[PDB]
């Protein structure tokens, strides 16, 4: 289950084609944004993708949101702590 | 019903359960096979960590489902 | 290697003492701010902590910034993908 | 030098190395003791993933340092 931006965009197209019985053709990834959230001992990531696809042989632009649950997991033994700032208030 | 539990080193253990079974009971079965105490056990299904109170059926776990096991050292 | 806010504040105080040859005495943690992000195949978390310590036997409030590297790790076999939104533009 | 490699199951491996050694060389040592191929090996020190080309002294890895090992599985 890869996390590369192009694979995520293709997942979006394949999932969209299946849900709405359409047949768009993936062309390119234009831009991507990622925001992450920590839930308990797991990590979640949201991907915001701008992509190129062909609807009727006509190239169009689409925006997709992909939610990845357990994109990461907490392992306490490997974490490394570093102090950046220490000041009185 | 039979379900699969997979370790981070790729080893797979087979379990016998029923949908009514709680997560605490599944951890107990894992403890008997692998000698790991349930308190030190972490179970992941569908991108979520399973809570002790709920049952297998609550998470919509079915035959041939695979769960992921993580240890607390 | 705990990620609990109280343990993190003690780390900040203990590290500050070693770094600046001082000896503040940790009392308690008041509040914390946390945000996480994915770096390569790892996750990092940044902590902003407000705590109480004793300078001369007098309690004071301090603000600390703690950077935790590899607070999480990417494990591909466990991630779960879901498409949330697909729209033209 | 003697360093420690720890698996996610809590197993600890003892190794013999010295600072001139590369990460690729450490992975080779791990394979000889534990039979795991280097491509499937991930090594963690000080919260970062170690690159094969560089040496232990580059990462300031020292006597009794502990490395963390994570496996890459196709499954």
Author numbering:
A (entry chain C), C (entry chain A): 33 to 121
B (entry chain J): 1 to 73
D (entry chain K): 1 to 75
Provide the publication's sentences verbatim.
Ub can be ubiquitinated at any of eight primary amines (on the N-terminal amino group of M1 or the side chains of K6, K11, K27, K29, K33, K48, and K63), and all eight Ub linkage types co-exist in cells (Peng et al., 2003). Affimers are 12-kDa non-antibody scaffolds based on the cystatin fold (Tiede et al., 2014, Tiede et al., 2017), in which randomization of surface loops enables the generation of large (1010) libraries, against which epitopes can be screened and binders can be selected. To understand the observed linkage specificities, we determined crystal structures of the K6 and K33 affimers bound to their cognate diUb at 2.5 Å and 2.8 Å resolution, respectively. Both complexes show a conceptually similar interaction between affimers and diUb: each affimer molecule binds one Ub molecule and the affimer dimerizes to bind the two Ub moieties of a diUb in a linkage-specific manner. The variable loops are responsible for dimerization as well as Ub recognition, and specific dimerization provides two binding sites for Ub I44 patches with a defined distance and relative orientation, leading to specific, high-affinity recognition.
In the K6 affimer, the first variable loop extends the existing β strands, whereas the second variable loop extends into an α-helical turn that bridges to the second affimer molecule and engages in a strand swap of the last β strand. This leads to a symmetric dimer, similar to what has been found for naturally occurring cystatins (Janowski et al., 2001). L74, I105, M107, and M110 in the variable loops create a hydrophobic surface that interacts with the I44 patch of Ub (L8, I44, and V70), and four salt bridges further strengthen this interaction. The dimeric states of affimers in solution and in the crystal structures were further confirmed by size-exclusion chromatography with multi-angle light scattering (SEC-MALS). This showed that the K6 affimer alone is in a concentration-dependent monomer-dimer equilibrium, which is shifted fully toward the dimer by addition of diUb. The strand swap observed in the K6 affimer crystal structure is likely responsible for the relatively stable dimer in the absence of diUb. We found that the K6 affimer bound tightly to K6 diUb, whereas no binding could be detected to K33 diUb. We found that the K6 affimer bound the cognate K6 diUb with very high affinity (Kd ∼20 pM) and has negligible affinity for the other diUb linkages (Kd > 40 μM). Interestingly, whereas the affimer-bound K6 diUb does not resemble previous K6 crystal structures (Hospenthal et al., 2013, Virdee et al., 2010), the affimer-bound K33 diUb superimposes well with reported K33 diUb crystal structures (Kristariyanto et al., 2015, Michel et al., 2015).
